[PDB]
Structure 1
Amino acid sequence: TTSQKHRDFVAEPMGEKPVGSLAGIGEVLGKKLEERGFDKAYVVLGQFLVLKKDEDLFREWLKDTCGANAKQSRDCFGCLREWCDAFL
């Protein structure tokens, strides 16, 4: 249902974890994200929060920013959504 990568991120405060620690974000996507400016998981969380946690908006932003796909954005989203329900 959820990747191990997911749980690891949802398990504890991201603090300074890199964006690549985000579920759905690997070396390729992660790389581009950093270049676009979002060079830290928390920065992506900021964008998530800014888009008021809206799934479509966020996932669509991701797809437009680093080029994630259906599974990628879905996982990254659900990942943050859960982290927030856990610590925010």
Structure 2
Amino acid sequence: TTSQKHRDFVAEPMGEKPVGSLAGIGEVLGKKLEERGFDKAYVVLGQFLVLKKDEDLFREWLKDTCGANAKQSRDCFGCLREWCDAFL
């Protein structure tokens, strides 16, 4: 299943939404992503696209970059994958 946060994200263009609008990215992860330059959701989309939408490599990058656990990286990947299927 998915959260409402996921459904809200995949339903519309992301524009300049902050990184915290991604499913899985709560306060703590969002801070650490901002510290490393990923301050908006589209920058994380960028990394997902550079990695050619590879689930294992993206989720591993997210863990390495901000400490996302398995649930959090699963949620974040899923919302970017579904967003891309709808809008890219």
TM-score relative to the length of structure 1:
0.99
CA positional deviation for 1:13: 0.4
Q: CA deviation at 1:57?
A: 0.2
Q: CA deviation at 1:47?
A: 0.2
Q: CA deviation at 1:9?
A: 0.2
Unaligned runs of 5+ in 1: none
Equivalences for residues 1-88 of structure 1 within 5 A: 1-88=1-88
Cα offset, 1:51, TM superposition: 0.3
Deviations 1:12-66, CA, capped at 9 Å, x for gaps: 0000100000000001000000000111100000000000000000000000000
DSSP 3-state at the match of 1:64? helix
Fraction of identical pairs, as percent: 100
Partners of 1:64 and 1:16 in 2: CA distance: 24
Aligned equivalents of 2:49, 2:21: Cα separation in 1:
18
